[PDB]
Each structure stands twice: as C-alpha cells, then as structure tokens.
Amino acid sequence: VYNYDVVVIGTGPAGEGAAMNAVKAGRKVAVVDDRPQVGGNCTHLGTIPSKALRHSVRQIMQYNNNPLFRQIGEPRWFSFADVLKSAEQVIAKQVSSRTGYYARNRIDTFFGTASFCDEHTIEVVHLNGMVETLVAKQFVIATGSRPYRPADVDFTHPRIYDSDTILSLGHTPRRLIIYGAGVIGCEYASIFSGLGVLVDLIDNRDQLLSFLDDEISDSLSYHLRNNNVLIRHNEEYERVEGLDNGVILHLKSGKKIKADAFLWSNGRTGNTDKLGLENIGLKANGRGQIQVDEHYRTEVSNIYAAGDVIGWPSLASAAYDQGRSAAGSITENDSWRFVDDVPTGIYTIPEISSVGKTERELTQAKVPYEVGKAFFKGMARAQIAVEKAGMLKILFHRETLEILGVHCFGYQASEIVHIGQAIMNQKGEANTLKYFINTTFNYPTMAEAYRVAAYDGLNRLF
Amino acid sequence: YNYDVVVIGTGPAGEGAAMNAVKAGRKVAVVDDRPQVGGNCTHLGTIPSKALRHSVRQIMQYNNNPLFRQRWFSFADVLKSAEQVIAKQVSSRTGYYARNRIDTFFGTASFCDEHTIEVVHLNGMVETLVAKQFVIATGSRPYRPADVDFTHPRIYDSDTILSLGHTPRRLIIYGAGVIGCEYASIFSGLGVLVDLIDNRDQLLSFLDDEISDSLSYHLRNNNVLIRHNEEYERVEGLDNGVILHLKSGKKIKADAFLWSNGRTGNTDKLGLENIGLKANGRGQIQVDEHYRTEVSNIYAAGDWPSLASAAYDQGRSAAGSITESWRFVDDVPTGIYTIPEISSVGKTERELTQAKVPYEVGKAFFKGMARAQIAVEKAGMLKILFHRETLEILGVHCFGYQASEIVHIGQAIMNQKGEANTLKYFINTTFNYPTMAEAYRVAAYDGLNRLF
Amino acid sequence: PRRLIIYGAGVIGCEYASIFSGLGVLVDLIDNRDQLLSFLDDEISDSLSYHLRNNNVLIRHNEEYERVEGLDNGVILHLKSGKKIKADAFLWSNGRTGNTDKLGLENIGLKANGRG
Amino acid sequence: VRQIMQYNNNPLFWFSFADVLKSAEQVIAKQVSSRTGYYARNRIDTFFGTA
Ligand SMILES: Cc1cc2nc3c(=O)[nH]c(=O)nc-3n(C[C@H](O)[C@H](O)[C@H](O)COP(=O)(O)OP(=O)(O)OC[C@H]3O[C@@H](n4cnc5c(N)ncnc54)[C@H](O)[C@@H]3O)c2cc1C
Ligand SMILES: Cc1cc2nc3c(=O)[nH]c(=O)nc-3n(C[C@H](O)[C@H](O)[C@H](O)COP(=O)(O)OP(=O)(O)OC[C@H]3O[C@@H](n4cnc5c(N)ncnc54)[C@H](O)[C@@H]3O)c2cc1C
C-alpha cells in the first residue's frame, strides 16, 4: 500500500509534464507505466525512432547525391537494420535523461500495468504478483493509444506490420504498401521512398492531408510522386492476404496490389481497456478516447485526462503541454491554459508546418486577406543546404496587416514556422506583417524568407 | 544617362536600396566594378565561407557517423561545391534586377560633382550618369598593413584564402574577429593544426563570457591553439612555410597564413573630395540617423556592424529615407558561423551586472535535447536572461547547431512592448516536437524554478 | 506588362498564363473551380499547378469576379470573396460564344442556345 | 549545334568546339547515375574490369 497526492498513469509527454508540474507545486506525486523504461511512445516506439530513421535517410540521400563523396566509390545501398541502429543511442540518452529528471525531483515510479478500483485506489500490477495498491487524491490519465487493429486484418503474419512492429523489419523490402494517408503513413512513405522502396501509398480520401493547405498538399503529392511513391486516392480496402513471398491487398474498387511488405497506419485507439475505468464509472467511446472539459477534468472531479488519450491533436508537444495544464488545473496555480492552437507538423522529406487559418477557410469566411510567397529555390541558405525544393506562404490581412495563417514546406519547416507563430500570438496591432520589414534578421538563414515573403505581400498591396 | 537614384555597389545594401527605390516608382540604376552582381556577400565573403563551413560540417558528420564508415579530401574539392551556389545566387540576383527594369553598369564609379559620376571599365570606358539621389554601398576590403608581403604565395587574406590549392599541414590566423573565428573553425574541422592569435585576452569580448568560454573550449578541443594578448612583430615568408615573430618573443612556423584583422572601406577610388566628403582612417563614411552624409542628396549604407543582413536593412532604410519606411538599424542579432554556431540578441550578463538590473538566468543544455541528440550534435547551450519582476526578456544567447534559426523566436518575443514581451509566453505556447525551438520552453521552466 | 490577371482556368487561360510566366510576368491566375482543369487526371493537374506556382503564377481557387475597375495605371479586380487584385493588364478567357447572331437563323427555323 | 544554328538564324537575336561539347557531361552524369541506381535497386552486382 502506497499513499500520494497525485498519481499519473503513463510516462509519455503528457504524463511527464503533469508529474513535473505537480511536483513543482509542492505535492508528493507518483508515476505508473507498464513499459520497463520511462519515456512513453514519444521515445520508445513512436516519435524518436521514426525521427532518427528520417534523419538517417536524409543523411543517406544527401551523402549519395553529394558529388564530393562520390569519389570514394559508387553509391551503396544500406540495410534497414543499419539505418535503424542509430536510434538506439538516441533512445538510451533520452530515457537516461528522463529517469534523471524523475529521480532528481524524487518522484516514485512503478513499472507495472495500471488498473482502477475506485476514486482513490489503483492496483498497479507487474508481470509477477506485485499488487502494490496506490491511493491518491488526484489522478492524471495519460495512457496514450496504440495502433488501430481491425479484426479483418491479421497481424501475426511476418509480412504484415503496424506503426509499431514496422521497426522489427530486418531487410529493406523491394516494394511496400501503406494504408491510410495520416501523419504516420506519410512520414513512413517518405522515409521508405528515401531508402529506395516503391511505396504504393493508399488514401481513403481524394486529397492527401485535406486538413492542410491545398498548395502544400499538392506540392507534397508532387514530390512523393517524383520520389517513386504511387499515391492512389478514394480507395477502401476489401481484404488483405498474406503470402509466402508477399502481401496482396484487394481493394473495394477491384484493384489488387502485391508488395513485399505491408504497413497499416489508419488511425489509433486509446489504451483504456486495461485501465478498468468502468469501476470508476467513466465511459470510453469506440475510439478509446476520454471526454474532458476545458480544464482537462473528466466527469469525476478527481480524475483528469490529458494527452494523446483524449484524441485531438495527438501531438507529443501538445500532449506534454496539455498534461502540464492539467496538472496546473489540479494544483490551481494559475498555470492552466486550454491547448487549442497547435502548429501542425508533418515530418516527411522535406518537412511541412502550418499555424493559423488556411486559404480555403479564409476564402469560405470571406476575409480580405493577401498572400506573400517565398520560394526556397532562390534562397542562399537552401542552396548551400543543397535542398532547393520548398516554399513558404504567409496569409496576411490586407488592411490591418494582421497575420491570419502561416504555411511552410521544405527544409527546417518546423523551426521556421515558430517565428510566424510568435508574431501571430501578439494582440492588436502587434500582430503585423510589417514587423518582418522592421526587424533585422541573420544571414544567410531561412528566416530571411519572412523578409522576402513579406515583400511579396507588400507589392500585392495597393 | 538620366536616372532618379543611382547606387554604387551591388551587394545586399545596394541591391536592397535599389529594390526599395524602384518599388517607389522611380527610375534607378546600379553600378559595380565586379564582372558579376552580388557583391562581396556572394562572390568573396558570406556565401563562399558558408558553403565551405557547411561542407566541413558534412564531412565531419560523415567521418564521425558509424553508418557511413563502411578519407581526407583536398581543399579544392571542398571549395568546388561553392561554385554552383554562387552561380545560382548571381542568376537569381540578375533575374531580380532584370524583372524590375534595373540598368546595370559594370565599371568603377568615380565622383565628378554632387549629381554626376563617371563609370570606367577595364578597357578605358567613360560613361556619365546624373541622378537626383545617390546611394553609396561600396562595401569594404581586407585591411592590408604595409609591413606584410601579401604577394607571397604562402600569405593570404580573407579574400585570397580561397585561392588555396592544397590543404596545409599547419596554419596561422591573425585576428580573433568573426571572420578569423569562422575560418579557424572551418580549417580545424578540415583537420589542420590552426594557431589562432588574439590581440586581447578574451575571444569575442563583445559576447557573453560563458559563450566565449565555451567557444574557446571547443576550439581547443578541436586542435585550435589560441594565444591571448599577442601582437605581431614581423611576418617572414620562407619557401616552405611562414614564420611569425611576435612582440612577446615567440616564433611560430606554419605552412600558411591568414590575415583577418580589421576591414577598410572602399572609398579611395570614389574620389569623394570632388563632392566634399571625407573618409576616416578606416575608410568609413559618417552618417546621421537617416543614413545621410553631409551632402543632402548623398546617402551611404552598409559596409559597424558590417553584417550582410544589417547592410541589406540599412540600404533599404536609406532608400526609404530618400523616398520618404525609414528605420534606424541599431539592434542586429550578432551571429558567428563557427562549428557550432553562435548567436546573441539584447543585453549580455556583464552589462546587466554593471547596470544592476535584477534579472535571472534560464538555461537549456543541448546535450539533453532530443532533436540535438538525433542531429548527433550534443554540444550546445541556450541561455535566456529575463527580468525577474516583470518577466521581460533582457537578453538571449545561444551557442550550438542551428543557433541563428533558434535566436529569432527570442528576438521576436523581445521586440514586443510592455507586458507582451514576457517569458511566460514560452510556457503558454505549443511548439513543435522534436525541435530545438522547444528547448526555449525548457529554458523558460529552468527560469521559473528560480523565481520565488 | 509588370503584372497580369487572367480570369478563367480554361485551355486559353492556362496557355496564356504559361506564356506570360515564361516572359517573366507575375501572373495572377483566377479560377472558378477548386482544381485546375478538373476534366483532366488528378496527377497531371497537380503537376501543372505545381509548375505554374514555381514559375511565378499565383493560382487562386473558387473565386468569382464582382467588378473589374479600369484605372489609368492598371486594372483592379474586386472578387466576391473580398479580394481586390491590381495589375497592369487584364485578360478574359472565361468561355466562348458561337458566332451565329449575325447569321440570322430565324429565316430557316434554326435557333441557337445561350452559348451560341 | 542545332540550337546554335537556330540562334544565329533568328531575327529575335562563332562558338568554340570545347564549349559546345561541354554540355554533354551533365547528360552523361545524369544517365550514369540513373543506370547505377537502376542496377543497385534490383541488386545486380558489378565488376569494373576487363573480362
Ligand atoms: C511513428 C510515429 C511518429 C510520431 N511523431 C510525432 C512527432 O514528430 N510529433 C508529435 O507531436 N507526435 C508524434 N507522434 C504522436 C505520438 O504518438 C504522440 O503525440 C505522443 O507521443 C503520445 O503522448 P501521450 O503521453 O499522450 O501518449 P503515450 O506517450 O503513448 O503514453 C502512454 C504510455 O503509458 C503506457 N501505458 C498504456 N496503457 C497503460 C496502462 N493501462 N497502465 C500503465 N501504463 C500504460 C504506454 O506503454 C506508454 O508508455 C508520432 C507517432 C508515431 C506512431
Ligand atoms: C569570410 C566572410 C564571411 C562573412 N559572413 C557573413 C555572415 O555569415 N553574415 C553576415 O551578415 N555578414 C557576413 N560577412 C560580412 C559581409 O561580407 C558584409 O556584411 C556585407 O557583404 C557588406 O554588404 P555591402 O553591400 O554593404 O558591401 P559589399 O557586399 O562589399 O558590396 C560592395 C560591392 O561594390 C563593389 N565596389 C567597391 N568599390 C566600388 C567602387 N568604387 N565602384 C564600384 N563598385 C565598387 C565591390 O566590388 C562589391 O561588389 C562576412 C564577410 C566575410 C569576409
């Protein structure tokens, strides 16, 4: 039997943020996670491995396409294991840093499966015995989610994978099939295309990432097509069949596609079945998500849920800040803020980032805006980076010069979009495009785009 | 020829001034003595050095990456990559000039009176140009003291160093300036024992002490030998290597030599005495807050701070002042592109201590940064100086990979007025992950712990 | 011209937009549909739109004109969505009408629809 | 050569042989890179020697 003030379930970004914010408030807090090591999906099976894979693929592409490195010999193809082995050092460093953060503030951890009993009692169960019941006044739910696994699709087949088991690949397949045009699907399609795999990406919609800007989606589709990715639109699978040497997918429309592997990336389902939330009396929808208010509090006054478990936006930074806000709400130390605006980020090759309104929404809302474009092809920093494809678009109000939406696609997109976001968050006349002409930047960087694009807007203004 | 505004120099200052003036609807023209547009920024200064540094970083990462092991290269092969970037930049600038109907004259410009100039090319040209407004963007050149033989094949400057054909075994850099530090870092990355010589006791004293100390430690760990408080006595060029005798009594022998001490304005050929303008010892032109010289219709911009972006902004501000958009370029984020990069904005810790401002320090080390770990660049640091009571940001300093792109968020938060410029923004704003911009958040939290 | 506005994303409009972009003019193509040449394949339309965007052509989607005012130094087009675009010229390529009004088809019982 | 001919005989507006031949190396480099990629993707072993 153990007693605490705040107990967090799951050590992901939401759980870590909630635990840190709560322990900063002076309470005694504990964390529970069924994985043998801390970090959550952000470090073990999700963000960190995929990002290391993407960075290694980008380095491979740049090394192969750099003439200076071609004098040593001919281009060499590399196995998937060698590319993935670079993620082990990164995940080890990250888990060491996270456990050091936990230990420095003296936060107790319990590496075992969690299970709810009542409004205060939880049965943290290990693999062997370890009832180890815990009682606390406040609870944070950061159980996250797992890849969606339809019953009609078998996953025990060695040639069929999901967003988690794909890292278990031993050899680079000649071909590949990706179902679902989500963030994970597009990222893996870009990575495998960089590795040199004819990826047959399958989408359930007619446009890739319809929630993004039309121009950005069109450019991404063109680049994917130019990088051996075959994109099929308005498709629904009918049956997937595993063979000895490949996987054959028969679509509803009548097309059958055979590849050497398969990767399902269509949605995620919250990990709430093992929680036993019915003992609390709370309910989970078909998506496995938990309804929370603007204070990140569930129906029970002492039960708080935040992060990827609640569904939208399912972003690691967003989950982290949501957990911190939920902990602030628990402690009522005026640190709460409803996470609503999150800069959308897609980590393909190259990257995509967005903040604020899109062009289609602005057109529907009849806002008198204007467009300022800056193309990476004419950029000194981009030319030195040997990365020429890309663009940045700034949507700015014509009369008040207010910024209504910033969208970028290319190299360092996520780092670039942050300055536009910072200018966006300003109130009143401070949110102005003229800042980009009234402030000196560094050179040669990619931030100079915010200069050039601004000019491309001001010329269109009369 | 008759025009409204005539600009001398096609660098960032001149190009910006010409573009801003032509945006006003006037008829403008540009003159330069280089056979191609771009200025020293693209042809001899910024762009070639940046390409060299990026190639050095790439080869260093390739060598250190275990995946790429299953290989030293000559200096010429490394420098070859800059030609494509230079060609693309000059093509883009020529397209920008042509699309705007900008007349270009490729010859040295000399002043005749307050309104007209003579353009002389390589083959004895004479062209008269008269305009109401003039812009001076002649840039600068490396300072050349008399007592050093720059004609020696083993002695170079910040310009002729690109003429190197073979990578030297040892090298000497005089002057601990931004250019000197950048070249020392590049040559150290290439694998050359660089002996940097500094006149003062601290590298880049205008920077924060912590940043300078970290940079010095990294340079020392990267085969660069830094000597402090030294002044040259005599440079002697032997057939095999350059020998420098210092005032302290030391003799240093190397296979090359680079001079990066100071810059000299390119005003001797302008003949400013024909219009009533004088140049100081360093060849600079005194200007007011409007970037205007003593003559009412003569304006000078660009090549302090001698920054390409700052020169661009100064040229655009001078053009706006001519057309009546003016803004005095005073606060420029200092950026040194060594390996790793260094950037700073706002007041440093020494100035805050002198002024007794009650501030506090929030740190976020890049060693624990996830994105930095993926980049395999763990050495770094992000320091934020924030006012304790009103939570205003008084200084942002960064030393690491992608420092320049990081510092711009702190600069954007800085320029806000009053309560808007607050550190708590970094707590109430969702960043991208995994990014090193989100490191800001960590730093902010590392500050909020120290509050009470 | 310094700048140019093209109304209608038809064959003629796209051809002239490409020509003027090649000449080095910032073309602002205006389309009444959400996609360029919806009767064509999605991949081909996407590639053409990407090339036009990369070649200084600014494509705006789902727009309908409200008033084309002719200034002395340019033309300002006011759209239904609230966007006003100023250029140094203007080109109309929205459909064609049959040249049958002058034929006088009523003398033979023949008639033409609204499209001529 | 055809482009040179159409340049000289165009109302809108000699060349050294080396300058004219200079354009072929970009094409040959692109072609050899593409063929090497084709060989490597399907895993065909190469031996650069006299058989
Ligand atoms: C390939 C890939 C790449 C991604 N890249 C990004 C990216 O770049 N940026 C981004 O923002 N997001 C990214 N994501 C999304 C990412 O998964 C989430 O944004 C985030 O990592 C989840 O945060 P969380 O703490 O809410 O969930 P989690 O981190 O998944 O929290 C769940 C944790 O609790 C444990 N747990 C689960 N059930 C129980 C239980 N019953 N008892 C005890 N412990 C339990 C789990 O084992 C896990 O450790 C990516 C996802 C994938 C799959
Ligand atoms: C190695 C190196 C690295 C640098 N890196 C950076 C960096 O990363 N960032 C940064 O911001 N700055 C950097 N700089 C500084 C940069 O070179 C200057 O800040 C900037 O280029 C000056 O702009 P300008 O147009 O005023 O001068 P210039 O670019 O020098 O423009 C002067 C032009 O006019 C021509 N000219 C000169 N005299 C005459 C005449 N009498 N008649 C006609 N034409 C004439 C010159 O040939 C030249 O083309 C670097 C400098 C060096 C040497």
Residues in Cβ contact with D10 at an 8 Å cutoff, skipping those fewer than 6 apart: none
Q: Say what the resolution is, in angstroms.
A: 3.7
Sheet of C3-7, strand order: C58-60, C26-30, C3-7, C91-92
A444 near B46, Cβ under 8 Å?
A: yes
CA distance B380 to A86: 20
Q: C44 in the Ramachandran plot: left (φ > 0), alpha (ψ -120 to 50) or beta?
A: alpha
CA distance B253 to B245: 9
Which residues in chain B have their CB less than 8 angstroms from residue A85's CB?
A: 67
Q: How far is CA B204 from CA A411, B101, B195, B343, in A?
A: 31, 43, 16, 12
Give the side-chain half-sphere CA count within 13 A for B314: 30
Query: Strand pairing partners for A264?
Result: A162, A179
SS3 B178: helix
Phi and psi angles of residue B362, each rounded to the nearest 5 degrees, phi first: -120, 125
Q: Determine the residue type at B344.
A: S
Pocket lining for ligand 2, CB < 6 angstroms: A 443; B 8-14, 31-34, 39-41, 45-46, 49-50, 108-109, 137-140, 158, 179, 266, 269-270, 302-303, 306-309, 311, 337
Nearest-CA distance C24 → chain B (Å): 7
SS3 B281: coil
Q: Which helix (H) or strand (E) holds B2?
A: strand B2-8
CA distance B223 to B193: 6
B412 near A422, Cβ under 8 Å?
A: yes
Q: Which of C74, C95, C112, C70 is nearest to C8 (CA)?
A: C95
SS3 B243: strand
Nearest-CA distance A456 → chain C (Å): 11
CA distance B119 to B127: 5
Q: Which of A192, A228, A257 is nearest to A50 (CA)?
A: A192
> Which stretches of B121-158 are assigned E, i.e. beta strand?
127-136, 140-142, 156-157
One-letter-per-residue 3-state SS of chain A? CEEEEEEEECCCHHHHHHHHHHHHCCCCEEEEECCCCCCHHHCCCCHHHHHHHHHHHHHHHHHHHCHHHHCCCCCCCCCHHHHHCHHHHHHHHHHHHHHHHHHHCCCEEEECECCECCCCEEECECCCCCCCEEEEEEEEECCCEEECCCCCCCCCCCCCEECCHHHHCCCCCCEEEEECCCHHHHHHHHHHHHHCCEEEEECCCCCCCCCCCHHHHHHHHHHHHHCCCEEECCCCEEEEEECCCCEEEEECCCCEEEECCCEECCCEEECCCCCCCCCCCCCCCCCCCCCCCCCCECCCCCEEECCHHHCCCCCHHHHHHHHHHHHHHHHCCCCCCCCCCCCEEECCCCEEEEEECCHHHHHHCCCCEEEEEEEHHHCHHHHHCCCCCCEEEEEEECCCCCEEEEEEEECCHHHHHHHHHHHHCCCHHHCCCCHHHHCCCCCCCCCHHHHHHHHHHHHHCC
Nearest-CA distance A366 → chain C (Å): 5
Ligand 2 centroid – CA A376 distance (Å): 23
C5 near C90, Cβ under 8 Å?
A: yes
CA distance B403 to B398: 6
One-letter-per-residue 3-state SS of C3-41? EEEEECCCHHHHHHHHHHHHHCCEEEEECCCCCCCCCCC
SS3 B389: coil
- Touch between chain D and chain B: 3 or more Cβ pairs under 8 Å: no
A175 near A197, Cβ under 8 Å?
A: yes
CA distance A430 to B412: 11
Q: Determine the residue type at B324.
A: E
CA distance A14 to A326: 9
CA distance A405 to A213: 10
Ligand 2 centroid – CA A270 distance (Å): 58
Residues in Cβ contact with D14 at an 8 Å cutoff, skipping those fewer than 6 apart: none
CA distance A209 to A182: 7
In chain C, which residues are last before a break of more than 2.5 Å from C to the next N?
none
CA distance B199 to B228: 6
| Helices A47-65 and B46-64, axial angle in degrees (round to 10) | 120
- Tokens matching residue C45: 């339309």
CB contact under 8 A, A369 and C83: yes
Q: Which of A341, A274, C111, A441 is nearest to B310 (CA)?
A: A441
Give the chain B residue whose CA is nearest to the CA of C23: B99
Give the side-chain half-sphere CA count within 13 A for B329: 30
In chain B, which residues are last before a break of more than 2.5 Å from C to the next N?
70, 303, 324
Give the chain B residue whose CA is nearest to the CA of A427: B420
- Tokens matching residue C14: 């796209």
Smallest CA separation from ligand 2 atom 34, residue: B9
Residue A443: count of CB within 10 angstroms of its CB: 23
